[PDB]
């Protein structure tokens, strides 16, 4: 029984259920007995009476055991078999082993060109923001689902909408987020798993499978099997929006799971297997492309930081007053990576521009710095969390990253960010209000924006490893400056 | 006009008026209208009977060829293997649009697997790889076990364009090649510009009749076939080619950032042509190679680049609790001999020498300080050709050719001083220096054992040039270096 309160930990994986846009034969690992079947299958294949202890062979001929069997060998991913003949009727079958299980998934019949026709519209974007943009638009066009987003996910694994194309009567959630509990650790590990999870009916009846634990006592883990059926939990929550089906398309960055392209779709929807299998290649090249444009940008950005510090460099040795410099100088360092204020503090003295805390906080914030740090860059998102006094100028200054110019004096550079919330860009409607069922109004995604504005309060976006890369270059021309110049003065 | 050694740097190879025999060319308009130009073979090949020129192409080839030859020019040129001509015969079409002509070429169809099927299996053998090393070592013994050629190498372009081999799968009676280079010179830069424009170049037979273009000069304009698979070959290179005892050859272009790293080159001693299918497999695995290739680099580049900082970051720890930091270098400066490749290093601190391995005599160290300290900006200064900025460096060019040097200081000429061998010294060269090639006309130019010497000749007293990488390592020291010097003086 998932509720609220352990919906955190539902086995997701062995729910003893799959949805009823196809049907499940779960065999032994050398696919010579069926051990489990969906309630379904009788009516979907057209086969009578209790199909466990039934040979593989009895229930799907000799020719559909042979061709599964050779196919097997192919398994990696599940082997997906469009158009199989069985009584010389056609199924997309769906076929893998996971726990000494073979599970063959069968959905009634109905690649390479409509994933190479999608790939053509975005292998020419030549920036992040481009490919997030006309991907959502393409995807929504192509596969016919009312909404697409795009979700990436932040370093505390919240996702943010980054990418949206709706029906023009729907409510936007562009530039909202949600917490990290929206989707617990098991999805988050499934999502990682499976490029696609497919929601045919958000209202569909579940499909028991026979047995739901065996006579060991073992479930039927479902990890694999694109049938599994949905958390009633998140059944409700697409039912609260008006959603009734849905595929998401994992993207992976580095190995991980970087965001989700969700689509969603108002009333029930399932693409056949040659369309899922054509938006499965999409997915690997959007993928591969995103994570090309994520590194040229990276590139650019450490490239960008490098040639301004080297005319710093230059600058200064034809100045005999460093101090000075960089009194005159620090605003422009605000240049170097995202931030909303920068500020110098040497020799006791404060010089501010943009939002910083004021004058009057520095002092502490310094010694902070001095006590925390080992001479190197220090930062966090969180400055209330490291000195509680900062939480009067939250609003203005909740995240700071400080370079040391000098392990003598406690003389910084110091960068800030507002609060996360003070630099939204919501395009969505305050005044859209949901329904709710039995789990209430937790299962809204007005309830999840307010959930993840309190995870943030007097936070800031957290300093990147870019940022941090940004920051070391920064410190290290500043050792470089204050040395050439003791060499020469 | 006629090529020899004194003209084949401008030879105009992209219009020789000629094509090799494996196949047949008809030229067309933009449109596919009519006929303009025909390879002479059209006929015997083809089985047209009379003049193609001046007919409508429908006329030559059927309504329903050109319509369907219409529609893949609709959606590099279009291979289209297995098409059926209006005798009922398949052919392999291959078609290109270029210089508002159409060219189509033509050869008689075999029985072939799915390009995709034939390229997955070959790419399933590469994509485990997991160092540069490994995938270039494989990929010869795997490409000459697919396509069954004689010998595949792989060439690597070096900075100054000569080719160096670094794989090599052959027949057990053949010559190696292996760790051989050639100089930029035998590849002029017309080929290196179709290497780059074309994945794939055939030559079927090195010692085959040409086969005329007609007509040749048309307005007064030659057939542009830089982008034809049947183009003929320059006499040069088949004279080459004949002088090594090659009879055929196929190279897949190695593409690294839109530029041209190198050649995975298949050569036969008979001659030889793969079937279209199997040559769009052995693109579509080049494709592969060339993404699988840049992985591999970039990661080996990050983990060399990531060994380099964290070394120097220990050694930054280490020096803060040293009060001498002089004599922590003097102690320390050969482990520094680990960021990047080199044969020697130095310390030169306060008129005093530290050699570690390769590294020029005592007394050659004030000269190449003194001009270090001239040509510097107090930045890090790198050659790999020493004898060329100081005359005197000849002397000693054996044990150290190259020399990248890290200032200590801008007020001392002080250095850590890198070193490298003259490029001979290093060879792993797995020839036969007693394999003797016979010549044609053109001498013994046209000849590995010419083209090495020549090579040798273009690198003498120059080390292997510092990379774009090691520069990056030095500049990552330099810094080190002046934080050292920089939290002494702060403390002391
Ligand atoms: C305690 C467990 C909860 C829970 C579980 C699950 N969520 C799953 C998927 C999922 N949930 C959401 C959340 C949203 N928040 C929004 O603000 C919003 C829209 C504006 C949405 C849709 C998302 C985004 C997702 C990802 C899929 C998608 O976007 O379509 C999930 C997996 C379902 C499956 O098996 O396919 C589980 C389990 N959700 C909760 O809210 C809680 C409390
Ligand atoms: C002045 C022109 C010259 C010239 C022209 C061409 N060379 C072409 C191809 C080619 N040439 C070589 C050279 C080699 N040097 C070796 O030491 C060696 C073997 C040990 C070889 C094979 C190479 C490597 C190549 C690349 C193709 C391959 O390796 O198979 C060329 C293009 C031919 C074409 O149309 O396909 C031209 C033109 N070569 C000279 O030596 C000079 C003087
Ligand atoms: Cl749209
Ligand atoms: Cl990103």
New interface residues.
């Given amino acids: 029984h998932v509720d609220l309160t352990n919906c955190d930990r539902e086995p997701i994986h062995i729910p003893g259920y799959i949805q009823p846009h196809g049907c499940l034969i779960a065999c032994d690992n050398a696919m010579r007995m069926v051990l489990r079947h969906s309630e379904n299958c009788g009516e979907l294949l057209g086969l009578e009476g209790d199909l466990n202890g039934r040979t593989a062979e009895d229930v799907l001929g000799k020719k559909l055991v042979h061709d599964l069997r050779n196919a097997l060998t192919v398994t990696t991913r599940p082997a997906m078999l469009p158009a199989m003949e069985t009584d010389g009727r056609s199924f997309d079958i769906s076929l893998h082993r996971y726990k000494s299980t073979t599970i063959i998934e069968f959905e009634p019949s109905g690649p390479l060109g409509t994933a190479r026709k999608m790939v053509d519209r975005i292998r020419e974007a030549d920036s992040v923001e481009s490919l997030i943009s006309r991907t959502t638009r393409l995807v929504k066009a192509t596969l016919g689902y009312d909404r697409v987003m795009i979700y990436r996910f932040q370093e505390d694994g919240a996702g943010k909408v980054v990418s949206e194309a709706k029906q023009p009567e729907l409510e936007s959630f562009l530039g909202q987020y949600f917490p990290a509990s929206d989707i617990p650790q098991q999805a988050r590990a499934l999502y990682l798993k499976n490029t696609l999870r497919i929601i045919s009916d958000a209202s569909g009846t579940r499909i028991p499978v026979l047995p739901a634990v065996d006579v060991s006592g073992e479930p039927l883990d479902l990890s694999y099997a694109h049938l599994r059926s949905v958390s009633p939990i998140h059944c409700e929550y697409l039912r609260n929006m008006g959603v009734a089906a849905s595929m998401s398309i994992s993207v992976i960055v580095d190995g991980a799971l970087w965001g989700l392209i969700a689509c969603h779709h108002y009333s029930p929807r399932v693409l056949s297997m040659p369309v899922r299998i054509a938006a499965e290649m999409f997915g690997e090249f959007f993928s591969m492309h995103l994570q090309v444009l994520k590194q040229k940008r990276r590139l650019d950005t450490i490239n960008h930081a490098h040639a301004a510090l080297d005319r710093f460099l230059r600058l200064a040795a034809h100045h005999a007053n460093i101090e000075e410099l960089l009194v005159d100088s620090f605003q422009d360092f605000a240049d170097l990576m995202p931030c909303d204020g920068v500020g110098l503090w040497v020799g006791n003295n404060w010089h501010g521009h943009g939002a910083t805390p004021p004058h009057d906080a520095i002092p502490r914030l310094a010694r902070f710095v001095a006590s925390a740090s080992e001479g190197r860059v220090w930062a966090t998102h969180a400055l209330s969390q490291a000195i509680p006094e900062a939480e009067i100028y939250a609003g203005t200054a909740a995240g700071m990253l400080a370079i040391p110019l000098?392990?003598?004096k406690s003389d910084y550079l110091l960068f800030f960010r507002k609060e996360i919330v003070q630099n939204l860009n919501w395009a969505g409607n305050p005044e859209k209000s949901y329904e709710t069922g039995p789990m209430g109004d937790r299962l809204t995604p007005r309830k999840s924006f307010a959930i993840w504005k309190e995870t943030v309060r007097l936070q800031a976006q957290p300093w990147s490893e870019a940022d941090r890369e940004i920051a070391e270059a920064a410190r290290?021309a500043l050792?470089?400056v204050?040395?050439?110049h003791?060499?020469?003065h």
Avoid: G, K, N
């Fill in positions: 000098s392990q003598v290290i050792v470089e204050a040395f050439h003791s060499e020469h």
